[PDB]
Symmetry: C3
Subunit: 587 residues, 3 copies
RNA sequence: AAAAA
RNA sequence: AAAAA
RNA sequence: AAAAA
């Protein structure tokens, strides 16, 4: 009676027809919201969102926590541990936690301080399905039901390019003819007539068989093909969002009253603006970097002195308002004068250097530095029996090529805990590993168990693409006969309204090779890695209400040009797979 | 010279004669108290109790911590880990920590805030003895010596029903003819002539051979037999308590001065009583649940307003006194009008529903919900080589049937840490696992390695018995040919003085299927699980100075009636072991 | 261009010639200081020191943290874990962290509160070199560069006694003819003409082949030989310190401004001195221990009352000044009247008792107590297949004899966390294990995998030498045919200026078997363990600017006399290897 | 970490 | 721990 | 660390 259902019928043409079914009202009725998601009546996940009672205001950020529980009775097996129990999250559970957390975290209003928490449990899994793109839907549903200030729903799909057809939610036996495979997550903006979706997250990779299939006669995953993919995942996200909205229009709890804690009030920001606008503006027109820093520090002292004490005991509000003001002014500058915070041009990569044979007695090694970023990659071939043995719900058994990404605390100069990797390091390692598997040689043409270790010896921001380039260098050095070198580049996009003399219109600009500071002044950040001919990895997080096709194509072609320059810089360090190190094993 | 001994001679008639020897003054003379306990001059434990110097008042509870250290040189073996060192506590060490903590925690006075800590180390273990029932004695002794406000000593024994004889402290080769096996822990009340013991803890289970032995001609462990057992463990607890008291009358340190921190003073409680007694009393006479909640909230606002500020800055005392007052009034109501906090009768179980075949692609599964409680059990048969390999001091080698109990944070609606299980979850898993081993089929009639996973999807209190019922359902579903289904029920008992017109006498009442709130209004809480014919598991924690035999027999027969109703509700979901799932292995 | 080098040429005569090369300016340019250290162009470590921005004043101690990262690509191998990743630090990484932390921690000025941190990463390792004595140099260099208040540099070397020649930085194939092997770390004091080094740390052990080699005709590592070793490691420390100083005179960052937080100001200490000097002095002349404690407590009450409130809200300064005053007066007493804090003489060991056959059903066991210290050792022979399998950069494969050292919290009477061992326990276990390997029987004459467990049942200070004696007792008891028993003793040395009637001269005194309190009144603390004929382990931490050869020889001969008395006390408990326990395995 | 498966 | 054984 | 390777 109190169990409500709603289905979304995914229509893949002649490749089949799937049905994702959302059900609520039966299981876990104590959480703030709960929802069970079935994929083809056989895959079954349970998501349950709970919010804390009191807002922990001592925090300075929104404390959302996603957990994915891979129960092993889903696979019909007993865990293989010594204690026959499911222990700590595997790598796939962490990657799915990140997939869920990325489009869900910016969906909550700005200033929420309660401790929201989502826990997606895999209760059944058909051995031919993937569940992460279903975990996104289950989490969005169970958060939409909870009555939180969650501007959803958030529909997520996975599309694969099989024989020129973009198949949505493909099985595992179908992901062996696909050249490209991407997870797209978005939401619907506009009602009735302008209901187009607004993609928020893209995580794309070229399958391990892209080279053989493209040699067979397929179409390689270039940038135009990736744009066709981004435009061919919209109907499915529309279907999923419509189904979630039907269910939550049946059985949603009325919106609770959660207090929001803004960083600064309106009065303080208006005051800082009115009394420092022209000062900060003329502080930005000067062609000097460090001098501009000194002038900004002086303006900081000035706002601290002249606003004391008309606003007594409100120093954090002053600082937050000043940071918002300088961010707005730098954004307007980047939009109008095309000049970035370090005098660089929009299409200028920092100073590149690639060196091979850095570490002695290593099988292969290389040091790739770009600007302040400096990565060291060390490839360690070994016996094929050393391939990592995977034990999880996922379809794969062994991992021949392992990419491990270390981010020591002194990369930025800050002390901290050295030890176990965080979730960021797992995400960066996975992103930089899925960018090299398309070009690795076969297990018959090169029978070893490669293992890559990338060290962020110096960091300014977004070191995963630098790690892709350093991994290509180290892998060519160790003697591994890659099919083609894979470069990488991490760009951003700033979009906003500007007023010419009497017109107020939106304009966009792309920034090549952004720093860590240019990530807070950007409205989209995306990382493209690929060879000379096709993209092997792509990742994109945005919050804009839709990007025109021309702007996306332009930014992606700019990314290709950056990749080609980086590739011509890398091809001077090492052109071909060098000789095996005398310490390397021989098979 | 300063080494004092005292022996307790356990006289098991014709089954032997044991001697537990307590020794102090030689080892670990830096702790607040220390004592070595020998069982038959060969089993040797060392317990050492230490108290912190300053009372950590910021805590809101008594911070006692028990640890049991299973040193492996006791078993004559080197640890088998990769690092050849004893790592984290096994399951048996955790269960023994709980066995010690359960009768020891209520023995300290109310309001102690120092950080007491007990650490029992197993220094030698004969391979034919059990040491947990000896760990209780060692811990009680070493805490009685420390000069703490510890109202001991606490004597603990293990009795087994072998051929109609209740044998105390039986070996492992003797626990194979026993039908029932129970650990009893109690203390002596009354001096000289009325020195009868007052049992505080019972943890009982029917041995894995109960069905075969009862078929042979034994007497099945019914409720009258369990009462005979509770009355046949009194002389041994008397002996152990007398020995500990001899030793601590020889070599105990004078009682130190430890401050106590009451939750509320006498003045505040007297004031709240005098000014809210009749209001809260008439607030309880109304037949409405939610309306009564609103009236109690109104009385809370009233006590907060009219007592402000005659007691300024004393809000916690107000709240604690109000909670004590409402608890006392609800207790008097339950004693007089037989009506509980939710209008239920004393012999009324909540609304039951049992469903099988819930999860798809699972070997067996079932969902059992009772009231707000809702448990999901998933049975996963596999190959016999997957039985858990145990490596510890304990006598068992492998664990064929594994019960794992998960309590997610959203069971109550609260966010929290998802991950490793606490000690409560280990205790509940063990209690619900020892309730099903008496009825599991042999390793020859059903050659698999069963594994059960019980999920507390919805929780109000005491979900372990619900997990026993859900495990019976899931196990019958997966095709496992049980010998008889095993139900469970978690009851309580409220006992107190009441005054009829001119007489003040003690009366008792039993409450069937208590909630989580009816656990703070009860003077005993006990859980009984069993088949149609005999109890397979029992657990009981009390603080009363002895219960008449009639009251205990009545409460236990009431528990049997609850079990029979639950069993007739479960027999409609699934009557017989269903067909094996096509995914299950075939041997 | 910005990459600076400096080499130190170690000249081992006819045994070879090594070259340690320090390089800076290329890798990890974001840390406060960074330096790469090469040993023979093939071993390569990277050290990077970072300091926090703000001084965490809430701490009560200097928060330095050293980490050693053993990257496995150094050894050309993939890690062997299930997850094929380097997990938690091995034992060798912890011992190297301690080797670095011991001479580095007292090098920083007194009162630093920022959170310094050193992280030494092993990027390449020739399989014939050791890297810990190189890690000390890399850490001292990268800390000298950081611009901290670090009074370095600190040069560390390893010398081995091969055929009467003290070889510096010997390989692994050369450490098989050495009888003694010691790590020496020191710094240079005096400039120009009196530039002699001032050793700060010594960690010495006799190689596993000392007995066979001494039988061959070598010179056993007596105390005079160890003194010759301490005098033969000075030129190499001079070379290393000169090289580090050349580099840091090329490319060091100017000293930053770090605030220091003294424990007490000058005014408070001067006041407490002026108003309590004679009171505390006459409080020390009395021959009563406990009475002196009462008088000191009375003087504490007096300084708290009469200095209140001329210094209001300054209680911690009062306490720190009082502790400094009493420490100074006890030091002057020990220097002048030769009387220690407990009336003992300078050459008096506490009351010794050694007992064997303590624990029943153990392969071997013994209890050795000295004063308040009381250690229990339990030897557990087993099958040779149980030897610990090591997987790390280090040269060793298996560990036949394992010494595990447990320090329970109740050793001092304080509650705490029972569980994983700290770094102190690893250091003490290693120190007490390297003291028994010289005398263990071969793998052919006694084919078992011994394992020792030492329990600090009672502790006053420095229980590692007591654990060496208890391990000798337990090992003789279990039937292991040692080549000679190994005793141990932990002495200290107090050195200071004293003024006779008109002369102010430095005098030294040695204290045999110091307590835990006599460690804060001592200017050096060293532990010597050995057999009747030679030292098998030695450890020494000092801060003095050089000790005359006569004083060191005297203190070491005093240590030998203490060892001989302890050995004659141990030889009465058990003279010869007893019979194997009937539970022990037979090979 | 962290110093005593 | 969740964001940067 | 625990109590609920
Ligand atoms: Mg970015
Ligand atoms: Mg991104
Ligand atoms: Mg209960
Ligand atoms: Mg109970
Ligand atoms: Mg010492
Ligand atoms: Mg020392």
């Amino acid at each position: 009676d109190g169990v409500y259902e709603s289905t979304a019928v995914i229509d893949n043409g002649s490749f089949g027809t799937r049905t994702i079914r959302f059900e609520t009202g039966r299981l876990a009725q104590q959480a703030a919201g709960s929802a069970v998601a079935y994929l083809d009546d056989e895959t079954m996940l349970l998501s349950a969102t709970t919010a804390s009672k009191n807002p922990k205001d001592h925090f300075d950020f929104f404390p959302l926590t996603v957990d994915v529980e891979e129960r092993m009775y889903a696979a019909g097996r007993i865990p293989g541990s010594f204690f026959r129990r499911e222990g700590r999250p595997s790598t796939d559970a962490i990657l799915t936690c990140r997939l869920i957390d990325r489009p869900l975290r910016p969906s909550f209003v700005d200033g929420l301080r309660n401790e929201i928490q989502v826990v997606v449990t895999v209760m059944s899994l058909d051995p031919k399905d993937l569940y992460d793109v279903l975990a996104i839907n289950a989490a969005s549903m169970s958060t939409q039901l909870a009555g939180l200030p969650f501007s959803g729903p958030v529909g997520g799909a996975r599309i694969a390019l099989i024989d020129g057809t973009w198949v949505a939610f493909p099985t595992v036996e179908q992901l062996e003819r696909a050249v490209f495979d991407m997870v797209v997550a978005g939401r619907i903006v506009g009602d009735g007539d302008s209901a187009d979706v607004a993609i928020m997250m893209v995580e794309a990779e070229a399958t391990e068989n892209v080279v053989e299939l493209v040699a067979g006669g397929a179409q390689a995953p270039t940038e135009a093909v990736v744009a066709e993919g981004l435009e061919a995942a919209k109907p499915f996200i529309k279907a999923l969002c419509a189904a979630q909205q039907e269910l939550a229009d049946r059985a949603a709890k009325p919106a609770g009253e959660y207090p929001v804690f803004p960083d600064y009030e309106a009065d303080v920001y208006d005051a800082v603006a009115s009394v420092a606008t022209e000062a900060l503006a003329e502080a930005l027109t000067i062609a000097g970097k460090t001098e501009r820093n000194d002038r900004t520090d002086e303006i900081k002292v000035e706002v601290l002195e002249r606003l004391a004490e008309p606003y007594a005991g409100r120093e954090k509000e002053i600082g937050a308002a000043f940071r918002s003001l300088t961010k707005k002014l730098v954004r307007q500058r980047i939009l109008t004068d095309h000049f970035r915070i370090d005098g660089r041009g929009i299409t200028d990569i920092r100073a590149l250097s690639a060196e091979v044979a850095v570490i002695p007695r290593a099988h292969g090694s290389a040091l790739f530095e770009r600007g302040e970023t400096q990565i060291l990659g060390v490839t360690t071939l070994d016996m094929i029996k050393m391939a990592q043995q995977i034990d999880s719900l996922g379809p794969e058994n062994t991992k021949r090529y392992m990419h491990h990404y270390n981010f020591p605390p002194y990369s930025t100069g800050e002390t901290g805990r050295v030890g176990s990797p965080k979730r960021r390091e797992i995400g960066h390692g996975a992103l930089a590993e899925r960018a090299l598997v398309p070009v690795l040689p076969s297990i018959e043409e090169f029978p070893y168990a490669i293992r890559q270790v990338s060290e962020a010896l110096g960091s300014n921001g977004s070191t995963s693409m630098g790690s892709v380039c350093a991994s290509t260098l180290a892998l060519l050095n160790a003697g591994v006969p890659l099919k083609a070198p894979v470069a990488g580049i991490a760009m951003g996009l700033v979009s906003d309204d500007v007023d010419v003399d009497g017109k107020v219109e939106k304009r966009y600009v792309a920034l090549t090779d952004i720093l860590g500071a240019e990530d807070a002044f950007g409205d989209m950040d995306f990382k493209v890695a690929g060879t000379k001919d096709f993209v092997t990895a792509l990742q994109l997080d945005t919050k804009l209400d839709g990007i025109p096709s021309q702007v996306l194509a332009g930014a992606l072609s700019q990314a290709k040009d950056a990749r080609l320059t980086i590739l011509d810089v890398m091809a001077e360090a090492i052109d071909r797979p060098d000789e095996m190190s005398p310490y390397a094993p021989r098979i």
